[PDB]
Amino acid sequence: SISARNQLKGKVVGLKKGVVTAEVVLEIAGGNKITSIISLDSVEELGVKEGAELTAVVKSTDVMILA
Amino acid sequence: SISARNQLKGKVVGLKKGVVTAEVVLEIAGGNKITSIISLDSVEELGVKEGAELTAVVKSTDVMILA
Amino acid sequence: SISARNQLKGKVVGLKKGVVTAEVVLEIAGGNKITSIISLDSVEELGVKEGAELTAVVKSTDVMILA
Amino acid sequence: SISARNQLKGKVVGLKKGVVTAEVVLEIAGGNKITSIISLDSVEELGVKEGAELTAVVKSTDVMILA
Amino acid sequence: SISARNQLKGKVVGLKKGVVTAEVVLEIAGGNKITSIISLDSVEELGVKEGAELTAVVKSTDVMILA
Amino acid sequence: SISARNQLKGKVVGLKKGVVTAEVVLEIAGGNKITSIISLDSVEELGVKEGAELTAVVKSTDVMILA
Ligand code: MOO
Ligand code: MOO
Ligand code: MOO
Ligand code: MOO
Ligand code: MOO
Ligand code: MOO
Ligand code: MOO
Ligand code: MOO
Ligand SMILES: [Ca+2]
Ligand SMILES: [Ca+2]
């Protein structure tokens, strides 16, 4: 129940932990892949691990269109 | 060939024009819907129309993770 | 349970509805005020109205520091 | 005098330096905590340190609403 | 003294007002042009108009690279 | 042909690699400089290095105005 209109369910297929940030790669419907860069603290708090089923969220104003 | 690593192909299923901004809704693999808000100038220049085959692009640092 | 680390509870003190976007102003702790621009559809779906108690959410990478 | 309408004064209560990025945590009115991830270069240039009195700035189009 | 590392001085050559947002177009050094979409209220508050000399500011995390 | 209206051609004058992110600094027309923080993987994938000619891309909704 958040304003961000793009909510994409997926499964974790990759995780890389940096000093401040962390990279999460999710496989969503149709084989598409979504890549997320978040704080390292969050990775630790949401129990992010390979195989976990999670949801990618994006604000509409952050989505560009390519023709 | 742009750094934004998230590229999701889709078809236009919704279009609403504002004074400065415009809203484009794309249907992607699995019926998921991606909503984008961009400049009105761009819709016009990219010739966005119902049925067009376009692509949604998102920077990794804009993707959040939900548990 | 989302990665975005900034979650600020507040009360709606202002709402302006545009064609594509909408502006929401919330009063949070200490009298601070937060201003949000979201899609008009969201305003309609989350039942946004003056007096409503809601939460402002922000990704860490979108926060700048001013000295 | 910048368009970002959200300006929240606070004191530094956390600082973690990465190779490229850095994390700053500010305590604002009510003990709320704001977390910011910026360039390592900037922390150094703005002389960010525990106890400093700084200000968090956020563009309105980056603030989401949660119900 | 804001952490955002991109500060581009320029002159207003275009200004379009919408209901909630506004579009500002600046001509910057060297023949380049920058386009910004911000809140209508900020435009009104900073007294933006054709001919004004202002600065465009962008967070490093929001700049993409294209090859 | 991406909707992002800001496309600034430039040359790489600085490149710093971190664990998850990377910092690219470009010199653009007219003596201006642009700094970008993107994923380390994209840098590696687009083969970014000192001297390369590339383009910085920014969404209009991410450009702030300072008076
Ligand atoms: O209504 Mo949003 O937060 O622009 O997706
Ligand atoms: O070590 Mo970083 O600056 O979190 O990629
Ligand atoms: O390499 Mo990006 O531009 O953070 O997706
Ligand atoms: O960068 Mo975060 O961990 O989505 O607030
Ligand atoms: O009428 Mo708007 O301000 O382009 O949604
Ligand atoms: O007027 Mo803003 O820069 O969308 O907060
Ligand atoms: O990521 Mo910055 O240091 O706000 O440009
Ligand atoms: O808001 Mo835009 O049309 O992606 O620059
Ligand atoms: Ca943004
Ligand atoms: Ca952003």
Residue A51 CA to ligand 7 centre (angstroms): 33
Q: What is the CA radius of gyration of chain D?
A: 12
Q: Which residues of D touch F61 (CB under 8 A)?
A: 59, 61
Please report how many Cα atoms fall inside a 13 Å half-sphere around the Cα of residue D8, on the Cβ side: 31
DSSP state of B2: B
Centre of ligand 7 to C-alpha C14, Å, is 30
Cα B33 to ligand 3 centre (Å):
22
Q: Is E15 on the interface with F (CB under 8 A)?
A: no
Q: What are phi and psi of C30, to 5 degrees?
A: 75, 5
Task: Round to whole Å and give the CA distance between E24 and F64.
Answer: 10
Ligand 6 contact, E4 CB (< 6 A): no
Radius of gyration of the CA atoms of chain E, in A: 13
Contact of C39 with chain B, judged by CB distance below 8 Å, is answered with: yes
Q: How far apart are CA E35 and CA E24, in angstroms?
A: 6
Query: What are the structure tokens assigned to E42, written together?
Result: 């900020």
Distance CA B48, CA B36 (A): 12
Substitution site in C16, C17, C21, C44 for ligand 5 pocket (most atoms within 8 Å of beta carbon): C21
Rg (CA), chain C: 13
Distance CA C2, CA B66 (A): 4
- Specify whether the CB–CB gap between A3 and D65 falls below 8 A: yes
- Residues facing B44 on adjacent strands: none
The CA dihedral of F37, A6, B44, B12, to the nearest 10 degrees, is 130
* Cα A52 from chain centre: 11
What residues contact residue A45 under an 8 Å CB cut-off, 6+ apart?
Answer: none
Resolution (Å units):
1.8
Give the Cα separation of E8 and F32 in Å (integer).
7
Sheet of A33-39, strands arranged across: A33-39, A21-27, A6-17, A53-58, B64-66
Distance CA B28, CA B56 (A): 9
Residue with tokens 């800001």, as numbered in its chain: F6
Specify whether the CB–CB gap between A47 and B55 falls below 8 A: no
- Strand residues in B5-58 grouped as ranges (E): 6-17, 21-27, 33-39, 53-58
| Contact assignment for B3 to F46 by CB distance below 8 Å | yes
Give Cα C15 to chain centroid, integer Å.
10
Coil, helix or strand at residue E6:
strand
Between CA B57 and CA A15 the distance in angstroms is 21
Contact across the interface for B37 and C20, Cβ inside 8 Å: yes
Question: Measured between alpha carbons, how far is F25 from F37 in angstroms, rounded to an integer?
Answer: 9
Q: What are the residues facing E10 on neighbouring strands?
A: E28, E54
For residues E40 and E16, give the distance between their C-alpha atoms in angstroms, rounded to a whole number.
Answer: 9
Cα–Cα distance for residue pair F13/F11, rounded to 1 Å: 6
**β-bridge pairing C53-58 and A21-27:** unpaired
Residue of chain A whose alpha carbon sits nearest to that of D66: A2
Closest ligand 2 atom to Cα of F20: 5
E19 touches chain C (CB under 8 A): yes
**Taking CB atoms and an 8 Å limit, are F3 and B39 in contact across chains?**
yes
**Pocket residues for ligand 1 (CB within 6 Å)?**
A 3-5, 59-61; B 37; C 38-39, 42; D 64
Q: What is the distance between the alpha carbons of residues F62 and D22, in angstroms, rounded to a whole number?
A: 21
What does the block give as tokens for B38?
A: 């961009």
Q: Are D65 and C24 within 8 A, CB to CB?
A: yes
Distance from CA of E42 to the nearest CA of B (A): 15
The rounded radius of gyration (Å) of the Cα atoms in chain A is 13
Strand partners, B36: B24
> For residue F40, what is the nearest residue in chain A, using CA coordinates?
A23
Residues touching ligand 2 (Cβ under 6 Å) are A 18-21; D 18-21; F 18-21
Contacts of B45 (CB under 8 A, 6+ apart): none
Q: What are phi and psi of D18, to 5 degrees?
A: -105, -170
CB-CB contact of D13 with D25 (8 Å): yes
Flag if A65 and B59 touch (Cβ within 8 Å). Answer: no
Residue with tokens 């909630």: E20
Backbone Cα Rg of chain F: 13
D1-67 — its CATH code?
A: 2.40.50.100
Taking a C-beta distance cutoff of 8 angstroms, is the pair E25, E33 a contact?
yes
Identify the residue whose tokens are 């999710």: A26
- Beta strand spans in F1-67 (E): 6-17, 21-28, 33-39, 53-58, 64-66
Which DSSP helix (H) or strand (E) runs through F40? helix F40-46
Which residue of C18, C61, C64 is in closest CB contact with E18? C18
Cα distance between residue E27 and residue E31, in whole Å:
7
What single-letter amino acid sits at D23? E
Q: Answer yes or no: do A19 and F21 touch at CB < 8 A.
A: no
